[PDB]
UniProtKB/Swiss-Prot annotation, chain B:
Upper lineage: Eukaryota, Metazoa, Chordata, Craniata, Vertebrata
Family indicated by similarity: Belongs to the complex I subunit 5 family.
Highest taxon, organism lineage: Eukaryota
Oligomer status and interactors: Core subunit of respiratory chain NADH dehydrogenase (Complex I) which is composed of 45 different subunits.
Role this protein plays: Core subunit of the mitochondrial membrane respiratory chain NADH dehydrogenase (Complex I) which catalyzes electron transfer from NADH through the respiratory chain, using ubiquinone as an electron acceptor. Essential for the catalytic activity and assembly of complex I.
Subcellular location: Mitochondrion inner membrane
Membrane-crossing residue ranges in chain numbering: 4-24, 43-56
Name of the featured protein: NADH-ubiquinone oxidoreductase chain 5
From Swiss-Prot, chain I:
GO terms classed as biological process: electron transport coupled proton transport; mitochondrial electron transport, NADH to ubiquinone; mitochondrial respiratory chain complex I assembly
Molecular function terms, GO-annotated: NADH dehydrogenase (ubiquinone) activity; ubiquinone binding
TM stretches of this protein: 22-42, 60-80, 98-118, 147-167, 196-216, 224-244, 256-276, 284-303, 308-330, 351-371, 391-411
Coiled coil: none
InterPro entries with a match to the protein in the record: NADH4_N, NADH_Q_OxRdtase_chainM/4, NADH_UbQ_OxRdtase, ND/Mrp_TM
Catalytic activity entry: a ubiquinone + NADH + 5 H(+)(in) = a ubiquinol + NAD(+) + 4 H(+)(out)
Keywords: Electron transport, Membrane, Mitochondrion, Mitochondrion inner membrane, NAD, Respiratory chain, Translocase, Transmembrane, Transmembrane helix, Transport, Ubiquinone
GO CC field: mitochondrial inner membrane; respiratory chain complex I
Function (record text): Core subunit of the mitochondrial membrane respiratory chain NADH dehydrogenase (Complex I) which catalyzes electron transfer from NADH through the respiratory chain, using ubiquinone as an electron acceptor. Essential for the catalytic activity and assembly of complex I.
Domain of life: Eukaryota
Protein name per the record: NADH-ubiquinone oxidoreductase chain 4
Quaternary organization: Core subunit of respiratory chain NADH dehydrogenase (Complex I) which is composed of 45 different subunits.
Location in or out of the cell: Mitochondrion inner membrane
Length: 119, 56, 176, 68, 157, 60, 55, 59, 459, 128, 87, 171
């Protein structure tokens, strides 16, 4: 998008450097903003032989979807509600990643331009 | 499962009979294209089953 | 480079240029009717100066026509799939077994084919019959000590077959 | 009257050699394969025991297959 | 059979005798016979030919060896084995040769330079890191069941 | 006398014969030795195959 | 000489067009997803493939 | 018919003989990659359940 | 072993007091009986070598080469007529008896305890093949061929005698166990370098290496089929086995002094695979093919890994089989047409319809078709040399590419595409040549089924 | 129009723009006619030694045998050792050999010094 | 794949596609008609004719032949050389 | 049969599936018909052949060798001690290679059983594999082709000399 044009034309500051994203101190303007539920059953996450880079959030929807797809094999098209729920949960996880990206981006922009232009 | 390994190995070994057959033929069986076609069709229709068990 | 003469002529060179330009313009131009239009344009451009009495002007405009055609050729011309270079190049050469074979069979298989091999026996007798004398007489008879050509005269004298006939008559059918 | 005559090179010597080769490997291939089948289906291979105290076997009686 | 003087030791000198002998022996015209010459590289006195001769000799002359381009009496140029079709196409190229290699090397250089400019300049969407919960997925890496507890957590945003 | 008594008989001869390079002997010996050393608590393949007490090092 | 009075031709072409109609969906349904599907694409990024093919 | 008879009974019998007794001689041989069990499942062999998967929330 | 030796002596007067039209069947029959008798040798096991008392023993390296030799003899003895089947009775008996005596010294050379006995039987192996190829070489330079042959092999093989008498009179007797079990490491003097150069250079002559490779090709293309197959197979792999024996001594100096021989072997392997891509005289391409594979063998011997020795013996035996077969095919083609060249007699796909299958199978076992023994040898040599150095694999695969190139060029040059239709004399194939083909390629594929036999002492 | 087709040792010169065919003299006509006469006499002798029904064997071309005898055994005679041939032999024969020998010295020095330092990846490096 | 070609039918096909060409008549035209003498058409149009025969039958003719056909009967003879038009 | 004490095979884990379908289940009737067509006649033929085998009895015995005392108590040249010692050492070398092969087969089995979670329940078997291969790399590797027994002893002496020098410079 236009963020790519801004990173290739403008300053390198306010566009954050990729995959070195934890830059600023966490719980900066948060204080006490965390629960991180993670009710995805680590031992049962081992017991169900998932893939690496899938041992993460929203795993229980994958557990239930693989369970119903194991259960309903002649039903070639029945399991779609849990499939869409897992899609919805990873959609909200991408929402959280986008919000974290622009969290770090706007903290960089506002605070660093504030300090470096009112020092 | 015994059925899984058994049917995979017989899908491998159905692709062994015509070569040794017309190595040991000595009589020009003119329906040999029909023979190769029906053994490949039988090999496929045996190969669908362990894949069905796999996805099952 | 030809069996009859040493050089072709000027007219044959202009003629082959016409044929090759027509073929390469077939390969260049699809839809065949705009092609027919452009081929009539090429026929008219050759009808520009057909009426030249000069010779150095003729060969000079022929050389310039070769230049213009080499600037306007096509990389893959529509060579026919019968000709060498195309898609055949003796495509069905798998079964072009010559006839000096087919006599080296066991007499069981020769008993399977009695009539064809008896007629092959009479053809072989026809080859052997007047091979020596008449063909050596006609080949030692007609040329001067310099042959100077690659053709041969037919047996116009009295009788039998024209000389050196065997491997031109006996050949594959070109679709075996 | 439709067909043509094709010119095959030779088939007699080829099928003669291959018929002789299949018959002359078949003549003592099949009896030996039948025999080794009868051996390992009738006579027994071997059993899994060990050496008792103070009793010596020979340099055979150590092997799985009986013809070995 | 074969004459002793149908071998060919010795080079070209002199200009009457050995040139006339090569005309008689190689079945060629007198001035068409040219040795290489002998710069000390062996070669006998074997003739020079027009050197391409195989994508030449258009196949409608119908000579005696179609896939070999013989004529049973041709002198058979010294590099014959490098010349038969299945080895080297000595055709007139429809464009050039140096202009072709300049186009091709310019194209390969341009594509590799755009690859290098890509390699220094990556692309990425507005996308954060994937949040692996259990200490960047600890206890399933290549060891450390009890060795290094490394506390790091994500915050709900 | 070149194929029918040589080739197939040689195939049956080289197909099985005693334990070449003591191969399956080494298999069963290794099975018994690994079970032996697992039963006696010591780790399998004790390193320093020669006895480290049985050495007379050149001193310096 | 344009002839297709042939059971062999119509059987083979018939069965592979049947394959090119159904077998892609049959494969794409019942596989275990061994990766994370992205599924969150912007405007003018999912559309641009079919846009480029139509243009 | 006899083609189908021999080519779905004879190699099946020969290979299914070959994949019981010689595989139960040689120990480290054909091996599976494990059937996956879930929190909402049981174990067929002894007979006990894995306790079910925990609470869902924020769907 | 003497029970495997004395029927070869008793096989000699068989040919003499067998009458006319009778020598052939008796010699072939009884040499095949000897092939069964030598197939009964294989007993060797586990810890030690197998002693055949005091004069004799066998490692598990000499055993497959010996069984290969006595299997190769009836193949040759049936191979060697139709160019002397019309000659005299006494000279025919002399030829066959000279082949039998040659086999006798081959078995004497492979079964040696002392290296002096090995050297005497080595040049005893040398002397009859000289007479055979010089007398029936069938070309105008067979004189030069045998002359270069004997002079290169003696003039290289001669300081080996002085070095072996030196090792005799300074370190006890010359049992291979007692050359073993007692050898002290001889340090880096210059005399040790000269003695190593003498022994290794003598067998370098016999391999050949690249600097001495023009020894070979005249002695193949100007030689009959019997001396050619004995020469290539048994003499080159005999030199290889001799170096495999004698390389046990002089270990701390071969590391420092064995770099240039690896070098000349590698670069000559590359240049020899290049030289046999373009030549005429079809017989010679297999000779330079043998030079390429033996340079690969020499790289494998002079690096000293057990992987390298297993690949070495596999490459030896498989290339012996392949080269002997392909020489027999070139003999068949020359008996068809009396040209010996390459570009002339093309075609031969229409005619001789199953001879093409044997050209195909020989060229694919020369291609290293991967279940065959040839790729087993080449593969483990490539593994050991990549363990030796990290950059030599480019030369190995470059050999592989060009080897595939010239072998398959040989296949699609002479037997692909167009009969020249002036040949008009060749008759279809005899049962004898196809019988020799089935003698060739059944043992190679049966060893491809069960290859635990032919791998070396470091199994 | 066109850049007039520069030639090379790969790009063959076609039959159209020779241009020396168009400089017709009596010399070139006599040369082409005598060339036709040579090929005429050779094809006539071939067809007389080709079409006979009693002739069993091969045609026995002396030109092919002449090429083989020139190519195989006429290499070493004749020859004189000159400066050019000696420099080319020493440039193609010992040059690349000492090149690969220098780089094997380099790689072996690196491997020897590294495993003498012991910083190699031989946690398991068994199959040497 | 090869339909049964006979002599007189392929002669009729050659003379038919000559008859379809414009500037010569169907009236004074037979098998023993010439291409230079009685019809009086040039060599250029004669090679246009040869190109029509090549584009119908699908194979070229060599330029050793290209001057010396001049009548339909010898065209039929050369095509009978090419295809071996018999049973 | 064999010993499960020396070949670890972890115990079975099979669930009971739960349809939740009524088509139903083609492969269940397929495997029942397969058992009825194949599993019974193979059993019948095997029982016939087992009676024909076990009517009479053979025996193979595990060939066992004794223990040579030493190479360290052998003399300088004095061959007939060294021959016993080196062949006993060579048999130990062969059985140690087969130890490495069996532990590698255990590693392959631990890879194939544990699913895609490769690093679960294999760290101890990978650890003992690395332990035995560290011992093997230390003890038998860098000697080449002409091992008899003496080069292993020379390597052992030089290696413990290096260890002595390292700990003396460390002290
Ligand atoms: C003792 C046990 C073996 C006994 C064999 C008896 C002879 C068999 C026989 O008659 O075969 C018919 C066949 C002859 O057929 P044909 O109808 O007379 O004429 C066919 C043509 O000549 C054209 O010849 P072709 O097309 O038959 O030759 C092709 C050739 C090409 O070779 C390959 O394709 C080998 C590589 C295959 C891929 C490997 C992975 O061979 C094969 O395709 C055989 C494949 C298996 C070989 C390796 C096992 O025999 C051969 O081709 C000769 C033997 C070839 C090697 C057989 C090795 C068996 C082990
Ligand atoms: C690495 C070392 C590679 C060495 C390759 C040596 C090749 C020598 C043999 C050449 C040969 O046989 O050439 C035949 C073939 C002819 O090609 P051509 O006639 O143009 O065919 C097109 C339609 N006829 O020409 C070829 O097949 C060309 C040779 C193969 C391709 C070479 C270029 C790619 C590899 C470059 C090096 C990496």
């Amino acid at each position: 998008g236009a963020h790519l044009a801004r990173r290739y034309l403008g300053d390198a500051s306010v566009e954050p450097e990729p995959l070195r994203m934890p830059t600023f101190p966490p719980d900066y303007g948060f204080p006490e903003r965390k629960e991180r539920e993670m009710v995805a059953t680590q031992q049962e996450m081992n017991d169900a032989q998932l893939v690496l880079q899938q041992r993460d959030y929203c795993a229980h929807y994958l557990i239930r979807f693989l369970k119903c797809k194991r259960d309903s094999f002649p039903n070639f098209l029945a399991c779609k509600h849990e499939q869409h729920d897992w899609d919805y949960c990873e959609h909200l996880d991408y929402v959280k990643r986008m919000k974290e990206f622009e969290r770090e981006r706007r903290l960089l922009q506002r605070k660093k331009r504030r300090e470096q232009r009112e020092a | 499962m015994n059925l899984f390994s058994s049917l995979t190995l017989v899908t491998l070994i159905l692709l062994t009979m015509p070569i040794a057959a017309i190595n040991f033929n000595t009589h020009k069986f003119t329906n040999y294209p029909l023979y190769v076609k029906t053994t490949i069709s039988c090999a496929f229709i045996t190969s669908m089953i362990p894949t069905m068990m796999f996805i099952h | 480079f030809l069996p009859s003469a040493a050089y072709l002529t000027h007219q044959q060179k202009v003629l082959q240029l016409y044929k090759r330009a027509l073929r390469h313009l077939e390969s260049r131009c699809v839809h065949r009717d705009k092609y027919r239009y452009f081929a009539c344009l090429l026929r008219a451009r050759f009808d520009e100066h057909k009426n030249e009495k000069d010779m150095v002007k003729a060969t000079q405009l022929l050389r310039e026509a070769e230049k213009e055609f080499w600037h306007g050729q096509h990389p893959q011309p529509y060579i026919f799939p019968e000709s060498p270079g195309g898609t055949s190049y003796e495509r069905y050469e798998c079964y072009k077994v010559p006839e000096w074979c087919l006599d080296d069979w066991h007499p069981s298989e020769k008993a399977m084919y009695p009539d064809y091999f008896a007629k092959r026996e009479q053809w072989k007798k026809l080859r052997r019959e007047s091979w020596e004398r008449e063909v050596k007489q006609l080949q030692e008879e007609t040329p001067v000590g310099g042959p100077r050509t690659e053709a041969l005269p037919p047996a116009r004298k009295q009788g039998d077959l024209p000389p050196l006939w065997w491997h031109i008559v006996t050949r594959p059918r070109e679709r075996p | 009257g439709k067909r043509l005559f094709i010119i095959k090179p030779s088939g007699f010597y080829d099928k003669r050699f291959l018929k002789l080769l299949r018959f002359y490997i078949l003549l003592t291939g099949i009896p030996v394969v039948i025999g080794i089948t009868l051996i390992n289906v009738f006579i027994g291979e071997a059993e899994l025991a060990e050496i008792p105290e103070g009793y010596v076997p020979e340099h055979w009686e150590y092997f799985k297959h009986p013809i070995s | 059979s074969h004459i002793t003087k149908d071998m060919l030791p010795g080079p070209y000198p002199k200009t009457p005798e050995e040139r006339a002998a090569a005309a008689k022996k190689y079945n060629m015209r007198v001035e068409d016979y040219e040795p290489y010459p002998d710069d000390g590289m062996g070669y006998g006195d074997y003739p020079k030919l027009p050197d391409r001769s195989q994508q030449e000799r258009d196949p409608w002359y119908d000579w005696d060896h179609p896939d070999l381009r013989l004529n049973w009496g041709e002198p058979m140029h010294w590099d014959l084995d490098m010349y038969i079709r299945n080895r080297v196409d000595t055709s007139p190229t429809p464009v050039n040769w140096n202009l072709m290699c300049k186009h091709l090397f310019g194209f390969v250089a341009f594509m590799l330079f755009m690859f290098w400019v890509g390699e220094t300049y990556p692309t990425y969407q507005p996308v954060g890191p994937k949040q692996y919960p259990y200490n960047n997925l600890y206890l399933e890496r290549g060891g450390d069941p009890n060795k290094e507890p490394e506390p790091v957590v994500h915050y709900e945003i | 006398f070149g194929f029918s008594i040589v080739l197939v008989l040689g195939s049956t001869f080289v197909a099985y014969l005693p334990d070449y390079r003591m191969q399956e002997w080494a298999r069963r010996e290794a099975e018994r030795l690994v079970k032996y050393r697992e039963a006696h608590g010591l780790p399998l393949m004790e390193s320093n195959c020669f006895d480290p007490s049985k050495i007379q090092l050149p001193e310096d | 000489n344009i002839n297709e009075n042939n059971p062999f031709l119509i059987n083979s072409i018939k069965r592979l067009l049947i394959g090119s109609l159904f077998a892609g969906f049959i494969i794409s349904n019942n596989i275990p997803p061994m990766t994370i599907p992205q599924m969150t694409m912007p405007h003018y990024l999912k559309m641009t493939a079919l846009t480029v093919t139509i243009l | 018919s006899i083609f189908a008879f021999t080519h779905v009974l004879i190699p099946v019998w020969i290979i299914h003989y070959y994949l019981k007794y010689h595989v139960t001689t040689k120990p480290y041989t054909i091996v599976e990659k494990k059937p996956r069990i879930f929190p909402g499942d049981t174990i067929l062999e002894t007979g006990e359940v894995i306790p079910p998967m925990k609470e869902f929330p924020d769907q | 072993m003497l029970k495997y030796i004395i029927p070869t002596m008793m096989l000699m007067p068989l040919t003499w007091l067998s009458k006319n039209s009778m020598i052939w069947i008796n010699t072939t029959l009884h040499s095949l009986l000897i092939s069964l008798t030598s197939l009964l040798l294989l007993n060797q096991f586990g810890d030690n070598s197998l002693n055949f008392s005091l004069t004799f023993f066998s490692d598990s390296l000499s055993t497959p080469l010996l069984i290969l030799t006595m299997w190769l003899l009836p193949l040759m003895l049936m191979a060697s007529q139709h160019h002397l089947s019309k000659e005299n009775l006494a000279r025919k008996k002399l030829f066959i008896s000279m082949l039998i005596l040659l086999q006798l010294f081959l078995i004497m050379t492979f079964t040696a305890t002392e290296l002096i006995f090995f050297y005497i039987m080595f040049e005893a192996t040398l002397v009859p093949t000289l007479i055979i190829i010089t007398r029936w070489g069938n070309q105008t330079e067979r004189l030069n061929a045998g002359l270069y042959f004997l002079f290169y092999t003696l003039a290289g093989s001669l300081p080996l005698l002085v070095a072996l008498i030196y090792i005799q009179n300074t370190m006890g007797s010359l049992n291979f166990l007692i050359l073993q079990y007692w050898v002290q490491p001889m340090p880096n003097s210059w005399s040790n370098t000269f003695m190593w150069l003498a022994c290794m250079m003598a067998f370098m002559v016999k391999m050949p290496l690249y600097g001495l490779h023009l020894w070979l090709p005249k002695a193949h293309v100007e030689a009959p089929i019997a001396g050619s197959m004995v020469l290539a197979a048994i003499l080159l792999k005999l030199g290889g086995y001799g170096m495999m024996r004698i390389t046990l001594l002089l270990n701390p100096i071969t590391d420092f002094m064995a770099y240039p021989f690896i070098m000349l072997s590698l670069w000559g392997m590359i240049m020899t695979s290049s030289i046999c891509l373009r030549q005429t005289d079809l017989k010679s391409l297999i000779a330079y093919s043998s030079v390429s594979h033996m340079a690969l063998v020499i790289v494998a011997i002079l690096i000293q890994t057990p992987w390298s020795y297993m690949g070495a013996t596999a490459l030896m035996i498989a290339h012996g089989l392949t080269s002997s077969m392909l020489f027999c095919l070139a003999n068949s083609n020359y008996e068809r047409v009396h040209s010996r060249t390459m570009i002339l007699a093309r075609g031969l796909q229409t005619l001789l319809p199953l001879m093409a299958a044997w050209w195909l199978l020989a060229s694919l076992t020369n291609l290293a078709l991967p279940p065959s023994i040839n790729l087993i040898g080449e593969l483990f040599v490539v593994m050991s040399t990549f363990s030796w150095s990290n950059i030599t694999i480019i030369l190995m695969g470059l050999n592989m590419v060009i080897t595939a190139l010239y072998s398959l060029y040989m296949l699609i040059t002479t037997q692909r595409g167009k009969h020249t239709h002036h040949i008009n004399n060749i008759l279809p194939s005899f049962t004898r040549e196809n019988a020799l083909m089935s003698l060739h390629m059944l043992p190679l594929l049966l060893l491809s089924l069960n290859p635990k036999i032919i791998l070396g002492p470091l199994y | 129009s066109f850049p007039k087709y520069e030639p090379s040792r790969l790009a063959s010169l076609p039959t159209t723009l020779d241009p020396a065919e168009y400089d017709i003299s009596s010399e070139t006509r006599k040369a082409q006619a005598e060339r036709l006469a040579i090929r005429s006499r050779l094809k006539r002798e071939y067809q007389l030694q080709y079409n006979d029904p009693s002739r069993r064997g091969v045609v026995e071309d002396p030109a092919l045998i002449r090429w083989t005898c020139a190519r195989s055994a006429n290499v070493y005679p004749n020859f004189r050792p000159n400066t050019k041939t000696s420099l080319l032999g020493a440039l193609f024969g010992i040059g690349p050999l000492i090149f690969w020998y220098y780089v094997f010295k380099t790689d072996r020095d690196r491997k020897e010094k590294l495993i003498q330092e012991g910083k190699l990846d031989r946690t398991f490096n068994i199959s040497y | 794949d090869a339909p049964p070609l006979t002599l007189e039918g392929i002669k009729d096909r050659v003379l038919y596609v000559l008859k379809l060409y414009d500037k010569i008549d169907p009236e004074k035209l037979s098998v023993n008609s010439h291409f230079m003498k009685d019809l009086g058409l040039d060599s250029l149009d004669q090679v246009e004719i040869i190109m029509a025969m090549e584009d119908e039958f699908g194979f070229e003719i060599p330029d050793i032949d290209a001057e010396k056909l001049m009548c339909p009967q010898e065209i039929v003879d050369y095509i009978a050389d090419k295809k071996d038009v018999y049973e | 049969s064999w010993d499960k004490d020396v070949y670890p095979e972890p115990p079975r884990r099979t669930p009971a599936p739960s349809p939740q379908t009524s088509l139903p289940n083609p492969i269940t009737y397929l495997t029942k018909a397969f058992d009825l067509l194949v599993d019974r006649p193979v059993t019948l033929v095997r029982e016939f052949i087992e009676r024909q085998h076990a009517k009479n009895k053979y025996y193979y015995y595990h060939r066992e060798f004794r223990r040579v005392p030493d190479i360290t108590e052998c003399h300088e040249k004095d061959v007939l001690c060294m021959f016993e010692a080196e062949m006993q050492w060579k048999r130990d070398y062969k059985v140690d290679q087969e130890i490495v092969n069996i532990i590698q087969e255990r590693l392959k089995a631990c890879q194939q059983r544990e699913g895609e979670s490769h690093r679960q329940n294999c760290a101890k078997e990978l650890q003992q594999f690395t332990q035995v291969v560290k011992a093997y790399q230390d003890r038998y590797h860098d000697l080449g082709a002409h091992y008899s027994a003496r080069k292993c002893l020379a390597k052992q002496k030089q290696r413990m000399l290096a260890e002595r020098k390292a700990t003396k410079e460390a002290a």
